[PDB]
Amino acid sequence: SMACYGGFDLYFILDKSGSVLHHWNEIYYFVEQLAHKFISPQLRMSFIVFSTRGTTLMKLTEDREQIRQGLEELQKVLPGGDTYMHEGFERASEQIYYENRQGYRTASVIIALTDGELHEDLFFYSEREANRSRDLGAIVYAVGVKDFNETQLARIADSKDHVFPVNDGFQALQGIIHSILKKSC
Amino acid sequence: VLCAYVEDPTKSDPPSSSTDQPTTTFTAIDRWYTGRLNSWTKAVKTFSFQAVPLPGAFLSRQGGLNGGAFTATLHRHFLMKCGWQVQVQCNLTQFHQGALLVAMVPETTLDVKPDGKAKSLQELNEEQWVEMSDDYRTGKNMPFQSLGTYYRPPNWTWGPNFINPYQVTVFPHQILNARTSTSVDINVPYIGETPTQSSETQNSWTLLVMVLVPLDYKEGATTDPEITFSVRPTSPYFNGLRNRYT
Amino acid sequence: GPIPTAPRENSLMFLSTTPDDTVPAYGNVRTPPVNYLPGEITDLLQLARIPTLMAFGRDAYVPYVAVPTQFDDKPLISFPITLSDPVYQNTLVGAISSNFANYRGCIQITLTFCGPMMARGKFLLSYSPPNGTQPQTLSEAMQCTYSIWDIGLNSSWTFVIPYISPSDYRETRAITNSVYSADGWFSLHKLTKITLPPDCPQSPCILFFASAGEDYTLRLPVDCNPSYVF
Amino acid sequence: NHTNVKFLFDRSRLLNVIKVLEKDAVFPRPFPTATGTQQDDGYFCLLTPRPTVASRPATRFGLYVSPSDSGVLANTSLDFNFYSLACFTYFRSDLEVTVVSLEPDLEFAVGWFPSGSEYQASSFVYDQLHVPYHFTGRTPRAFASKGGKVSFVLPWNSVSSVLPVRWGGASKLSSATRGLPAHADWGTIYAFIPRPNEKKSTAVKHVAVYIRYKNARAWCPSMLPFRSYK
Amino acid sequence: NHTNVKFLFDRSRLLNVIKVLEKDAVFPRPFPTATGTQQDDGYFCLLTPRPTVASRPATRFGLYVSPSDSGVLANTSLDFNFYSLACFTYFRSDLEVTVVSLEPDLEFAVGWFPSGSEYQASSFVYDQLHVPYHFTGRTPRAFASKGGKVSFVLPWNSVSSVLPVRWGGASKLSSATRGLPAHADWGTIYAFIPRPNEKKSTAVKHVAVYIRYKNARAWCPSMLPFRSYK
Amino acid sequence: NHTNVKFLFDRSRLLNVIKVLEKDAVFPRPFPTATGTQQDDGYFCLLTPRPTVASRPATRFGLYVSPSDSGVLANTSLDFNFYSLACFTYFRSDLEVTVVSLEPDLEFAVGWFPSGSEYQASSFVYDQLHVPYHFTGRTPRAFASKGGKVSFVLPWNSVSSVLPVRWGGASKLSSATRGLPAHADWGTIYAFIPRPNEKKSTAVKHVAVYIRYKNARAWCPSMLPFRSYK
Numbered sequence A: 001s002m003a004c005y006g007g008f009d010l011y012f013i014l015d016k017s018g019s020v021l022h023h024w025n026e027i028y029y030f031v032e033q034l035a036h037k038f039i040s041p042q043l044r045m046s047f048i049v050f051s052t053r054g055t056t057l058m059k060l061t062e063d064r065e066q067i068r069q070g071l072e073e074l075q076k077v078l079p080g081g082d083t084y085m086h087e088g089f090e091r092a093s094e095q096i097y098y099e100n101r102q103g104y105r106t107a108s109v110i111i112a113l114t115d116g117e118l119h120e121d122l123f124f125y126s127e128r129e130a131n132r133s134r135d136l137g138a139i140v141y142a143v144g145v146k147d148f149n150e151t152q153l154a155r156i157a158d159s160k161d162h163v164f165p166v167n168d169g170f171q172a173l174q175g176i177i178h179s180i181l182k183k184s185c
Numbered sequence B: 001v002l003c004a005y006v007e008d009p010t011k012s013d014p015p016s017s018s019t020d021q022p023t024t025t026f027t028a029i030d031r032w033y034t035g036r037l038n039s040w041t042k043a044v045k046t047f048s049f050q051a052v053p054l055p056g057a058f059l060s061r062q063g064g065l066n067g068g069a070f071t072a073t074l075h076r077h078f079l080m081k082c083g084w085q086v087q088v089q090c091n092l093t094q095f096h097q098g099a100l101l102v103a104m105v106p107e108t109t110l111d112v113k114p115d116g117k118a119k120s121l122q123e124l125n126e127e128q129w130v131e132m133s134d135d136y137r138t139g140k141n142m143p144f145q146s147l148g149t150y151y152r153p154p155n156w157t158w159g160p161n162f163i164n165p166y167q168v169t170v171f172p173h174q175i176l177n178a179r180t181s182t183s184v185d186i187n188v189p190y191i192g193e194t195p196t197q198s199s200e201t202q203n204s205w206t207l208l209v210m211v212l213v214p215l216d217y218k219e220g221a222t223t224d225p226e227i228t229f230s231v232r233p234t235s236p237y238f239n240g241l242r243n244r245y246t
Numbered sequence C: 001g002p003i004p005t006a007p008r009e010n011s012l013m014f015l016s017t018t019p020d021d022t023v024p025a026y027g028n029v030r031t032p033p034v035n036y037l038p039g040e041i042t043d044l045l046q047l048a049r050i051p052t053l054m055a056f057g058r059d060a061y062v063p064y065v066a067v068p069t070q071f072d073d074k075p076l077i078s079f080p081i082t083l084s085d086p087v088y089q090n091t092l093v094g095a096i097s098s099n100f101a102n103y104r105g106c107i108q109i110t111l112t113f114c115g116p117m118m119a120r121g122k123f124l125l126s127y128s129p130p131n132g133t134q135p136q137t138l139s140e141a142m143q144c145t146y147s148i149w150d151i152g153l154n155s156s157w158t159f160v161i162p163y164i165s166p167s168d169y170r171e172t173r174a175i176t177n178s179v180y181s182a183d184g185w186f187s188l189h190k191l192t193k194i195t196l197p198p199d200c201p202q203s204p205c206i207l208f209f210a211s212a213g214e215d216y217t218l219r220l221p222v223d224c225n226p227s228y229v230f
Numbered sequence D, E, F: 001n002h003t004n005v006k007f008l009f010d011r012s013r014l015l016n017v018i019k020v021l022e023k024d025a026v027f028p029r030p031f032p033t034a035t036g037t038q039q040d041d042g043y044f045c046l047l048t049p050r051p052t053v054a055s056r057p058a059t060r061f062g063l064y065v066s067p068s069d070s071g072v073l074a075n076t077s078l079d080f081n082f083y084s085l086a087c088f089t090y091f092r093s094d095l096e097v098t099v100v101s102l103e104p105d106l107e108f109a110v111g112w113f114p115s116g117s118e119y120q121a122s123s124f125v126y127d128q129l130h131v132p133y134h135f136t137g138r139t140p141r142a143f144a145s146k147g148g149k150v151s152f153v154l155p156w157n158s159v160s161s162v163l164p165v166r167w168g169g170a171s172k173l174s175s176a177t178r179g180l181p182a183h184a185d186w187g188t189i190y191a192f193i194p195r196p197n198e199k200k201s202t203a204v205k206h207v208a209v210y211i212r213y214k215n216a217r218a219w220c221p222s223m224l225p226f227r228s229y230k
């Protein structure tokens, strides 16, 4: 946009299924490396998990005391259950709609994860709720932890370029979150 | 020999859901079927079980469990009705401590990936011991129905084929202690919702080896005992003769 | 003519637990026979008497009790004897009986020493009545009801917890249940210091069960706790 | 004998709160169901203690936590008072159904069709009124008075010998038909207002379905559900 | 034989006028209760001739003389027709409860839970309606017709052998638990309108609870209450 | 014995939805009927499983596909649940009629006149009110309560020995009276609101007629209807 974003946001939507059962420590190290890096207090971030209940594990807050308390919760999340990636997106879309009632032009960044991909009808609602999140004014980045399908996460994100493998993920998203930060206020 | 629910689990009438003569026998009925099972180490946590589905093991050959001419009789008959007889050995020495729980669980789906269809043989070698997570305690991993795009998919929070891991001693069981025995002897009869179930798709029993006390041994002493088992069907009644299953 | 009937004050009332039948709608059905199934549960006291594992805080709880080599004048484990206590939630005593209202009988803790074979020692098993303060000292454990369990031929001891109560039945979901506190205390004490042989692991584990006695009886079914499903 | 299996499950309890039909129904199409299928959802009560979804037998039980707008919500039923006291595998009993209205002064009527049969889904034009084909049939369509309660005892009709409380086989072929019994039900009921389809109202009237298991028989001792420690 | 104890207390009389539930209740928290506790007050009738306060057994009886605004008033019940003819100490009898509506054409329903058990206080979402967990259970939830009366006879369920009309001990430890028996009750009832919580109305509907003591047995001759001389 | 003929047809099923009389009727004139005949159509239920038209026995069964405006539509009834299981030619049974109202809180009344008799169609002026001649008679005029159901069992009254399910002769002479039995009926019923003709309302109230064949006897094995292959 022409005007800079008065508030900047960041949504960590993390899979905690039985398919990430051996790779949660790789996911939590990816979240902490994006949380303890961006120490700027203008960033309001949120921690969303999904296995069966799409749960907001940390609300949309900015202060680094609650975020460090939130990362104490993510370190003890035992993986287990199904993969409802459409309910990880409803927790984002019930926060974008709650924060579009102010007047600012903000920016919401979505980070989604999966090792074992979804069933045929679980993918359909996740495609619908990602469209629900895109229509509310967000940008979706489907970060890929180990072996997945590049085509399947391309329907969730904006395009196939927004999907990154997690070993390239912090290589990518170090400057992609920073891409808006060199355009923001 | 821990007989189950009767004095003699060999006693079994022919099924009342057939009009033909049952194939009561086959070419080697007084022999056992020995298969490997994954070794028990120190890193195995408490309640990390390992399920051997019967007769799901004769088909997938879980641990080299070759069924000989019982699998080749099960594939050539539609309805099958037998009572099992397992025998798990594990060479517990004086130098080990710990206690397995060998049970014969009725009607559970413990070989099923809490996230899909049925387990392969490579994936039984990768994990080696199925950890008792929140899914296996709440039954949240028996396979969910494909509802379709119309119905909104509900949050599946429970399923009746759980394991309550603290209650597995209600089943026909013997505890493979470090200082009472080295092998168990369980003999179970036929059960089922019908007088005889199918052959390719029945799971009426399940051999279940659960670690109650984790293995501890001194370094340099006897290390990592192997677990074998020996399944043997007692009085089968094969109905519905047809050709080999496709 | 017509029989003159005066209908009562509870007419047209569907009561849930009315001990009587109703009109058959689709009668004359010959059900398929169930003679082939073995093990018919006639009575659910056939499963309170089956010894099932207990739980211990050290949602990852532990059925056994670790035995540290430090000899000490305090109990190795001491849990209260209450069927609402969370060392009984996943037994078959405390899970069947929690869905009822009253019980009467003898809880039967079956022990199992899962240590090495050449271990030698004694254990003291003191059940206490409900006192104002929990007994801790082994001297406070000898004065209660005790039984000395040796690691000899007995690698499995079934300590029958007595039934001592001022009422014929006990409230089965209640912390207090009685005069001031906590309904009793089983306590496995170690009596002599345990000789574990070298090149055999130190810190053995004792595995606890919880069955019910032969005189265990239950009463008054209540609507259960449906919070297993969330 | 309050732990008696024939005594314990012989009492009325809630199963499902189903909506009352006001036209000729379309029975819910089997799984998977694609979008755009015009049908009638949640009007049918599959009479089974096992978990259901969309009036069909389900593997797991699933409720809704945040029921947002996209998609059609599904009537999932479960017998909460059963599984907490169902420490067994098989359970044959004769069902006693009671259908209590949840609408002030409702005249409803309760259909039924056995285990394995299907709903008759059309309408015949009697006197230029669409009278549906669930007013007639050889199965019990009990009629309620204005403000009354429908009650009848149903037999064990299914082709299975017993109902598996826990089942591990596969009804159809494998890959997500594990642990899904096909013929474990006493049938299905549904409520309908006994007026033709041109008198279809606008309100959505609910009704509640109770269940009593007459002559309960249970086999093969098994577990009870896991109680958490939080 | 009109002075016969089995004949004299064998007649119906008023106990309490309790309010009818219209949602999933919160049972009154035990004493002392601090301010700001969100709960549901006076909806429960503790079935006992002894004095009660906030649906829990009380030591004394206390009414209100000038009920001003500050604080929550407490439903205190007493059996006035009992103690004036209770010249004895202990009293075991089987209770007969009759619940008469004090609202014109009310459809209510009467729950119950035994002596020592507790109310099940939550709700399950059936068909996007909050149906509470007091519609189901193993305890009698009798349902009334529209304008009818609920009546049933309850047994002596408590774990005490008899009900102390006069009691001098201490249930818990001392310092204001003297003369307060804990297990002297036939249970507790409560009325609920059998509609889900989204159909909660605005009016506060009352109901009245009667009591008949079937098969009265009295022991240990004692005093009668003091009549004044004014 | 669920295939027993005495058991299979011994259950209630719908026959016709007839309109309720509110004046002295004119019975439908026999076929052919020219235009301009003032009469009362569809108010009479000819109690027969065979097809009817205009409350008279018909050869074929005929419904309407595109019921346009010109002409008077005719109440054609058939017992759908009969002929699909009527693999026989003759059928004598005693009829059990149940008349269920399809109007909220209707007070109706059910006349009857036997096989071969006719409706009495006039009115006598009682107290300056036209009371019709179907309030009186030697035949059963059962009266319903306000919101009730009329039920009675009718005998095999007809002069035929049995009812031909299939008939091939000619009742009158030939040329379109082939296959049309004249005396195959248990009679005819009709509903009337028991108020005189000056209190005739404006709405057109319907009512539904059920049928149970008590003591069914079937002779001469014959075919079942042809099921299509589309």
Ligand SMILES: [Mg+2]
Pocket: A017, A018, A019, A020, A082, A083, A115, A116, A117, B115
């Ligand atoms: Mg997964």
